[PDB]
PDB file of C-alpha atoms and ligand atoms in Angstrom:
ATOM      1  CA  UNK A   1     -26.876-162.002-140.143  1.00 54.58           C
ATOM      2  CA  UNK A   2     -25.289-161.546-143.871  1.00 55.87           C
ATOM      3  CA  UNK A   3     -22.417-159.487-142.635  1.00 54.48           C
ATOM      4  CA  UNK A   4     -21.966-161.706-139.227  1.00 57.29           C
ATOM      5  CA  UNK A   5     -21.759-164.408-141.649  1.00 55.91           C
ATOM      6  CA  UNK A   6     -19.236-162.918-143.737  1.00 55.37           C
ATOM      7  CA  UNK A   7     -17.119-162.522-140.540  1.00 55.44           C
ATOM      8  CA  UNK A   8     -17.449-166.156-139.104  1.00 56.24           C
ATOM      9  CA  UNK A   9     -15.818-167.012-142.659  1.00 60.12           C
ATOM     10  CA  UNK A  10     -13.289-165.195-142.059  1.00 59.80           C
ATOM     11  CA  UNK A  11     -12.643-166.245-138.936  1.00 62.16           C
ATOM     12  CA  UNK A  12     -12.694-170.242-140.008  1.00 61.40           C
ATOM     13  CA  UNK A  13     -10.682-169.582-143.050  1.00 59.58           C
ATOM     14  CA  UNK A  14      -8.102-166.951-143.082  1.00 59.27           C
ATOM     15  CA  UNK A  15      -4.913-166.764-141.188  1.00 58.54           C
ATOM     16  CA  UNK A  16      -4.834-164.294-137.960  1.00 57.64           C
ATOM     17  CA  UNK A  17      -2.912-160.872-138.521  1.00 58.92           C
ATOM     18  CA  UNK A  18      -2.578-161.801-142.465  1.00 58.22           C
ATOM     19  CA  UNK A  19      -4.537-158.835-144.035  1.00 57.88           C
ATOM     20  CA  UNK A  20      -4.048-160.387-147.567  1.00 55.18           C
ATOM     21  CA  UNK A  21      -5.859-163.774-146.428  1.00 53.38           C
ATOM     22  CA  UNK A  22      -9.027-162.059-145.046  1.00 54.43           C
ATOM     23  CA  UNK A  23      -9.783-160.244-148.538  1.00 54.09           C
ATOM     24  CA  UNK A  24      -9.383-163.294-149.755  1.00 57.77           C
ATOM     25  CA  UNK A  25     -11.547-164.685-147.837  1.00 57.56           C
ATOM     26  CA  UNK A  26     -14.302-162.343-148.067  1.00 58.68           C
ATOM     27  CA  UNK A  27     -14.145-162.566-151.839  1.00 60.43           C
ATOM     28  CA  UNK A  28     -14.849-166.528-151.474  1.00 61.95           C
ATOM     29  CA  UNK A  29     -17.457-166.248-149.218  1.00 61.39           C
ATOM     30  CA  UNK A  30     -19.090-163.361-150.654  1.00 65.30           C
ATOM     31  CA  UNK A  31     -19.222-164.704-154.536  1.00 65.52           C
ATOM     32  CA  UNK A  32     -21.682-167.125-153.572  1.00 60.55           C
ATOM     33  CA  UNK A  33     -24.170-164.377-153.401  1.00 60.76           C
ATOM     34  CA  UNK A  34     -14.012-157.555-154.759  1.00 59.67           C
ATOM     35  CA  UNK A  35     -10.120-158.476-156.079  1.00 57.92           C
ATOM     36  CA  UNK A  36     -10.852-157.164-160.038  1.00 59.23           C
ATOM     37  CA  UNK A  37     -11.911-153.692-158.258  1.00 59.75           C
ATOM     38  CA  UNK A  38      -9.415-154.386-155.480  1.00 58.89           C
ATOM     39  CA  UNK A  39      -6.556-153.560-157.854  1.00 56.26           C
ATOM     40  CA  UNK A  40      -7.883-150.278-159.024  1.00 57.09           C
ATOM     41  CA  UNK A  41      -7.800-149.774-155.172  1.00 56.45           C
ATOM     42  CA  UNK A  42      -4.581-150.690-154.594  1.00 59.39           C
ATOM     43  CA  UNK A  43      -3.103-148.414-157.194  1.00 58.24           C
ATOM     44  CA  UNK A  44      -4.352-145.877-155.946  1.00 56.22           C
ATOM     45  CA  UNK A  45      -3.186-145.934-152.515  1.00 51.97           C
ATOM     46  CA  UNK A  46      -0.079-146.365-153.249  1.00 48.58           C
ATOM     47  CA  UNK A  47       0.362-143.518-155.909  1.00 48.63           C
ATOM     48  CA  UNK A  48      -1.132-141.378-153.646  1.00 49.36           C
ATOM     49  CA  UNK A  49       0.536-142.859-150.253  1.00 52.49           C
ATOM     50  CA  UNK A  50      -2.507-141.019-148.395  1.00 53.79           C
ATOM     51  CA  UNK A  51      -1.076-140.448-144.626  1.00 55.71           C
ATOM     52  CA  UNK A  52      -5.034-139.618-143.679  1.00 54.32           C
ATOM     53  CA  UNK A  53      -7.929-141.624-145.336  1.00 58.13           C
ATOM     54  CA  UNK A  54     -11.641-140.895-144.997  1.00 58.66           C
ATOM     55  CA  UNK A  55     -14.050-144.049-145.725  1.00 57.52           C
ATOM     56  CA  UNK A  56     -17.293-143.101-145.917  1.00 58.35           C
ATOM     57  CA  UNK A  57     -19.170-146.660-145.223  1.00 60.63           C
ATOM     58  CA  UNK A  58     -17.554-149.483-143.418  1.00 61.32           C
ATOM     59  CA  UNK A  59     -19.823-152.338-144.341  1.00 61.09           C
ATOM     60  CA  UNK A  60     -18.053-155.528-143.350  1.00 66.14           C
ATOM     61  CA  UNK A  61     -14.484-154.281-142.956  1.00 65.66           C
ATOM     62  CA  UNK A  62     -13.179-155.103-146.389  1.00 66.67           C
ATOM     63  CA  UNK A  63     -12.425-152.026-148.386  1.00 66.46           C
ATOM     64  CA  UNK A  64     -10.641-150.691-144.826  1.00 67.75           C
ATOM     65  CA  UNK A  65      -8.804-153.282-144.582  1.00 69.77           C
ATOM     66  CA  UNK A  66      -7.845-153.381-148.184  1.00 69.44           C
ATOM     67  CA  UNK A  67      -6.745-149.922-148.022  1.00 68.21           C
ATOM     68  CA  UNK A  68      -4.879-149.919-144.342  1.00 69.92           C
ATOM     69  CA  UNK A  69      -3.039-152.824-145.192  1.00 70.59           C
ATOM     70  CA  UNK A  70      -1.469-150.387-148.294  1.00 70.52           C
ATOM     71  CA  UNK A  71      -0.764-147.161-145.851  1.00 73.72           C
ATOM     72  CA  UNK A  72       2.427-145.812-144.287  1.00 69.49           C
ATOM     73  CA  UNK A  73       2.972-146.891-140.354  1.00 69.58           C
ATOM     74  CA  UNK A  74       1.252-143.766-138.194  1.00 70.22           C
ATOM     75  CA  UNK A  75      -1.085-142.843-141.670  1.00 72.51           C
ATOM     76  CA  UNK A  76      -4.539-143.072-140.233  1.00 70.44           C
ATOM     77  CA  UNK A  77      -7.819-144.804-142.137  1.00 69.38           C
ATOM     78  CA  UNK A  78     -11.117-142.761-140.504  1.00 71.15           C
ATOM     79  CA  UNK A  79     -14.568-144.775-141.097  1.00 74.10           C
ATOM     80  CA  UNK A  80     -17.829-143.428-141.138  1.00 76.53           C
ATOM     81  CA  UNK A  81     -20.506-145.970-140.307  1.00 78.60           C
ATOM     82  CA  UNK A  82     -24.113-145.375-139.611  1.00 79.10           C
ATOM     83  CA  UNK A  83     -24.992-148.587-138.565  1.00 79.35           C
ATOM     84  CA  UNK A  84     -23.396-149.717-135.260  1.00 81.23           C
ATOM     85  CA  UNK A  85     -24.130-153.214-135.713  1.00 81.43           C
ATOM     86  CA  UNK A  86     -22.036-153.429-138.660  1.00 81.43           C
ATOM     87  CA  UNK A  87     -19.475-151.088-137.382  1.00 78.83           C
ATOM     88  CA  UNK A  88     -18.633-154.121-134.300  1.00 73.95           C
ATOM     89  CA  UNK A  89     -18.192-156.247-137.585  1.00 72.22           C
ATOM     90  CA  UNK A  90     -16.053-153.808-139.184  1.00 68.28           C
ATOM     91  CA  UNK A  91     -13.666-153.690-135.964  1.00 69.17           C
ATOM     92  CA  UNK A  92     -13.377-157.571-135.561  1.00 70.45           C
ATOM     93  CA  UNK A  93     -12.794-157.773-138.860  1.00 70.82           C
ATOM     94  CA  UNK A  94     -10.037-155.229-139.042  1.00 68.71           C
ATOM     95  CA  UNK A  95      -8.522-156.634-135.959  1.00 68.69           C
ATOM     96  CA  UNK A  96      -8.642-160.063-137.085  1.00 70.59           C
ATOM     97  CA  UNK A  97      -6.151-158.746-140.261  1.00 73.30           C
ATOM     98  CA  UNK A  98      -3.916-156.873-137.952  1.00 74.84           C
ATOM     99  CA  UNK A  99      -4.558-153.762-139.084  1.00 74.44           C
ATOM    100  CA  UNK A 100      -5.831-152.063-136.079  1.00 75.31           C
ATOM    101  CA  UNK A 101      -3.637-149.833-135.196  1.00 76.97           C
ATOM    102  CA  UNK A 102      -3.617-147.580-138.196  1.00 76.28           C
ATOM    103  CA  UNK A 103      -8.448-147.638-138.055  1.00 71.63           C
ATOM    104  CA  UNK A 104     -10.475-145.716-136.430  1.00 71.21           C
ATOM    105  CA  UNK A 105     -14.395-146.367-136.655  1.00 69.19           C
ATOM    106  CA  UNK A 106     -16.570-143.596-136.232  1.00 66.72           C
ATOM    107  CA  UNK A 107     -20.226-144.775-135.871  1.00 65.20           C
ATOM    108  CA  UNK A 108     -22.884-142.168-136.906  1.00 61.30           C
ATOM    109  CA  UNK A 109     -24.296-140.201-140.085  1.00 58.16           C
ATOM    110  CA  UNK A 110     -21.690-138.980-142.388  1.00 57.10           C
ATOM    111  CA  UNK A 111     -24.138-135.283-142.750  1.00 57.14           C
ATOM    112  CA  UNK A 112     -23.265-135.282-138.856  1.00 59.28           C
ATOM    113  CA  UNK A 113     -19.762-136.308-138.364  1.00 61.31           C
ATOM    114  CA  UNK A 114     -18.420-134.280-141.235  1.00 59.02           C
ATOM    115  CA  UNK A 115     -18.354-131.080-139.692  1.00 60.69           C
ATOM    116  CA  UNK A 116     -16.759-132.354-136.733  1.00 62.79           C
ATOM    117  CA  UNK A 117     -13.876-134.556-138.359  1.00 61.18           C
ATOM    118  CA  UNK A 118     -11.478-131.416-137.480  1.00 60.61           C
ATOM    119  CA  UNK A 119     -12.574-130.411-133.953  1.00 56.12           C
ATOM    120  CA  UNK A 120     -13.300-133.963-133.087  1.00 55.21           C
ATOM    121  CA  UNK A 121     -11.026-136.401-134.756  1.00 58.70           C
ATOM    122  CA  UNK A 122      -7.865-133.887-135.059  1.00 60.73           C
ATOM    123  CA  UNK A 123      -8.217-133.585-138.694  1.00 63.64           C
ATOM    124  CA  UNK A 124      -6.610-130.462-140.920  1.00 63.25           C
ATOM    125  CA  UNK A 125      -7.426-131.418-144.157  1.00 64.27           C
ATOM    126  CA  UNK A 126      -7.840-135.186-145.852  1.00 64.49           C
ATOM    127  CA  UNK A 127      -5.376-136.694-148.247  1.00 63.72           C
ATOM    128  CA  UNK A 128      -7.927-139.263-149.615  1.00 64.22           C
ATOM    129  CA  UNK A 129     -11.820-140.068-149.147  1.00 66.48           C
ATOM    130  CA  UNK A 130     -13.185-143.122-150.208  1.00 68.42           C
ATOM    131  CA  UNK A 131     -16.641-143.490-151.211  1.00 66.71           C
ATOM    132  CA  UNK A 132     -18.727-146.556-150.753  1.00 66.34           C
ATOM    133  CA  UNK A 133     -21.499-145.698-148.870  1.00 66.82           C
ATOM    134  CA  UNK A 134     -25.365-145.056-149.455  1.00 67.79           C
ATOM    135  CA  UNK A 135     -25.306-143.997-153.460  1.00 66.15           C
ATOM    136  CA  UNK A 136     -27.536-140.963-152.992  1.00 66.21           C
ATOM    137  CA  UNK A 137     -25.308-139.664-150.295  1.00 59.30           C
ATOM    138  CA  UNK A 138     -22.378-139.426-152.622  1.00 62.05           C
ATOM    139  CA  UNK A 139     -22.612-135.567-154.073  1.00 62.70           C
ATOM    140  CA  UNK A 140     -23.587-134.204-150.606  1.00 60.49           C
ATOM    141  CA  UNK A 141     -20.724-135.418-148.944  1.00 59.18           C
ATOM    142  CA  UNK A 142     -18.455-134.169-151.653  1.00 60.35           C
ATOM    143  CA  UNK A 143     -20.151-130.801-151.411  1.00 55.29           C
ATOM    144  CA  UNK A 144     -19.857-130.947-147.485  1.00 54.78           C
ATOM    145  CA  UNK A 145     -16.310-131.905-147.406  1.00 55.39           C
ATOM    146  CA  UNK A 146     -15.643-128.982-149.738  1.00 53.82           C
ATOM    147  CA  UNK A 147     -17.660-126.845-147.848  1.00 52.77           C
ATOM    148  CA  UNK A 148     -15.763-127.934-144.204  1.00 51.97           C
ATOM    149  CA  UNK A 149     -12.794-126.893-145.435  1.00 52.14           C
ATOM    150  CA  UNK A 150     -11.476-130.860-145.710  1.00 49.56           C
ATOM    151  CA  UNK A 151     -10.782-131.016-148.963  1.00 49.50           C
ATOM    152  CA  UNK A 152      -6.759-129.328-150.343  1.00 52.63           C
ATOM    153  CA  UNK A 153      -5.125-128.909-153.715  1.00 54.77           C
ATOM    154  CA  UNK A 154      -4.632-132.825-154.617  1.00 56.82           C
ATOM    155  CA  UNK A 155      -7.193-134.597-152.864  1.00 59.48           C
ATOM    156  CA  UNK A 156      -7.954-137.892-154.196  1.00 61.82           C
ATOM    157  CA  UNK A 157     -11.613-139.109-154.041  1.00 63.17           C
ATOM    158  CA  UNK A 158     -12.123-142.234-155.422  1.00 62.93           C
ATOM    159  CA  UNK A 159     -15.941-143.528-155.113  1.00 66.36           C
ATOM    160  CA  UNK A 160     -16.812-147.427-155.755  1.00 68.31           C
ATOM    161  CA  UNK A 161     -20.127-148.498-157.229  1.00 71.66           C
ATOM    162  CA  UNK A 162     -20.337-145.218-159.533  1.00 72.02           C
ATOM    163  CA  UNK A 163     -22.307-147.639-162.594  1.00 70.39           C
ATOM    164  CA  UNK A 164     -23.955-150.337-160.761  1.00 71.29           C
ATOM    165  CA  UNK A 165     -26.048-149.412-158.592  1.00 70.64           C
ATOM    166  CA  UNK A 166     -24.333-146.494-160.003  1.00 72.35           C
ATOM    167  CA  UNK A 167     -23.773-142.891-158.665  1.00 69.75           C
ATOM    168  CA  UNK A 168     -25.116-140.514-161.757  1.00 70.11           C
ATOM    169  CA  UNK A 169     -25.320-137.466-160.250  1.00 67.67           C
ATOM    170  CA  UNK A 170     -22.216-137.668-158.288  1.00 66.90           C
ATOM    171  CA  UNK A 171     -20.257-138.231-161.490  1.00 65.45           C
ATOM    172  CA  UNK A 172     -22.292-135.221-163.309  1.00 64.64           C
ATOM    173  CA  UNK A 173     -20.869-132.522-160.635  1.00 65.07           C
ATOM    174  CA  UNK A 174     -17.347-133.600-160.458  1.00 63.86           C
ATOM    175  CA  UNK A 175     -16.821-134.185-163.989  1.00 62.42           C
ATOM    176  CA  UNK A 176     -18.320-130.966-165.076  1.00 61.50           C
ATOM    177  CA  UNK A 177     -17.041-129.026-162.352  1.00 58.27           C
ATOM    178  CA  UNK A 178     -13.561-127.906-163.110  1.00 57.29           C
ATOM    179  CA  UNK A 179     -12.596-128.335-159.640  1.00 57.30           C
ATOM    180  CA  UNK A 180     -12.239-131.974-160.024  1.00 57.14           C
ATOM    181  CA  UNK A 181      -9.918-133.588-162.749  1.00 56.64           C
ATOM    182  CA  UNK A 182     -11.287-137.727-163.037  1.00 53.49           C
ATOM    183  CA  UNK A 183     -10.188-140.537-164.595  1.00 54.57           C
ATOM    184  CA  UNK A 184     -13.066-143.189-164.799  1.00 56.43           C
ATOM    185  CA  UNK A 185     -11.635-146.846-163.850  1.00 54.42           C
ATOM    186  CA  UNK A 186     -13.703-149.898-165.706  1.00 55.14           C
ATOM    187  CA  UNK A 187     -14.768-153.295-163.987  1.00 54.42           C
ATOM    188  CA  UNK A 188     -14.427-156.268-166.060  1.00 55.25           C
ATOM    189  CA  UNK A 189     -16.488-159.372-165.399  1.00 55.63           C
ATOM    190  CA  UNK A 190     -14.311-162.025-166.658  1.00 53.25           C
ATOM    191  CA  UNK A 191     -12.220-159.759-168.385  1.00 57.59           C
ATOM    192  CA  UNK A 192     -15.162-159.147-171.425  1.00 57.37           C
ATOM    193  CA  UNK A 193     -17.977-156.903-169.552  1.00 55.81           C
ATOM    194  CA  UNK A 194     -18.002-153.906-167.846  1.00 56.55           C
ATOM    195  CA  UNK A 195     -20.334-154.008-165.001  1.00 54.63           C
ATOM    196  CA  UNK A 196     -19.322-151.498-162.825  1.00 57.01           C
ATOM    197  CA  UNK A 197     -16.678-148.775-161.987  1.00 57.84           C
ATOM    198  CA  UNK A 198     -14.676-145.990-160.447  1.00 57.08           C
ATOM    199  CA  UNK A 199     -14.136-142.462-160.300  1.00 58.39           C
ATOM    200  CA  UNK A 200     -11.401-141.075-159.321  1.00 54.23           C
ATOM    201  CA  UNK A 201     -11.478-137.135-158.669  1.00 54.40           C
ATOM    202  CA  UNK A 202      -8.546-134.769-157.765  1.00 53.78           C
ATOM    203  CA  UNK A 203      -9.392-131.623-155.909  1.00 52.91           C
ATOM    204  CA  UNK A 204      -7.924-128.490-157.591  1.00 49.85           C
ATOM    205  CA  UNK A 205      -9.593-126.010-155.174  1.00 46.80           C
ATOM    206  CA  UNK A 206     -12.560-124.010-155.518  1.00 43.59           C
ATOM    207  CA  UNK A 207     -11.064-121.668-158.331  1.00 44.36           C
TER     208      UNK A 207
HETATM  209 NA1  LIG B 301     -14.226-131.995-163.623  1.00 42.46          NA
END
């Protein structure tokens, strides 16, 4: 009921087709129980200006919406959701900000859809991937985009959560492996602790 909950906040508070107001929002309702990560986000979107976007984990809508609000008209945010239940949350939500048009939700597991993003979803390679799913799923999607043939020469991944819960052994590979160069991206609580972080990884091929 968490996430419905999250979305009948939304729906009170924020102003229809305002993408801005619903991660705003979210953040209110969700402190309770985010915008210092959301401009680490934001930054990189629009260095990158990523005309096709892979989210792996949809959750409640926000980090899609975050992100499509940021891309080009006709760029194109794909999301990977296992769980349908909070994949119908993910589309009201990204309706309700207006940014429809530029989403589409792909409900299944990402081990499954992965090999099919090219045949299915008319996909040549990905400019961007965002990572925010299930922690322990973080390396072997990396290692199956690579493998699929999804991954080019200046690929962005950026994964969320990489400290807390904290993604160890996705960090390990792409930071030793000299196919990735990263640049680690602090969270500040309050500006005086880091809690968490990201990692942001550009492909450089397999070598
Ligand atoms: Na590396």
């Amino acid at each position: 009921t968490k996430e419905q909950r999250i979305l009948n906040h939304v729906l009170q508070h924020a102003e229809p087709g305002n993408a801005q107001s619903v991660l705003e929002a979210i953040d209110t309702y969700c402190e309770q129980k985010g915008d210092k990560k959301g401009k680490i986000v934001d930054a990189v979107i629009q260095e990158h200006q990523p005309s096709v976007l892979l989210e792996l984990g949809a959750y409640c809508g926000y980090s899609a919406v975050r992100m499509a609000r940021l891309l080009s008209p006709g760029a194109r945010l794909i999301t990977i959701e296992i769980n349908p239940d909070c994949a119908a949350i993910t589309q009201r939500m990204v309706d309700f900000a207006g940014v429809k048009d530029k989403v589409t939700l792909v409900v299944g597991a990402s081990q499954d859809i992965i090999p099919q993003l090219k045949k299915k979803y008319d996909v040549d390679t990905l400019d961007m991937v965002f990572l925010d799913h299930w922690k322990d799923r973080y390396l072997p999607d990396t290692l199956l985009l690579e493998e699929c043939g999804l991954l080019r020469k200046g690929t962005v991944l950026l994964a969320d959560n990489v400290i807390c819960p904290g993604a160890p052994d996705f960090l390990a590979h792409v930071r030793g492996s000299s196919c990735f160069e990263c640049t680690h991206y602090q969270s500040f609580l309050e500006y005086r602790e880091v809690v968490d972080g990201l990692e942001k990884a550009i492909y450089k091929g397999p070598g």
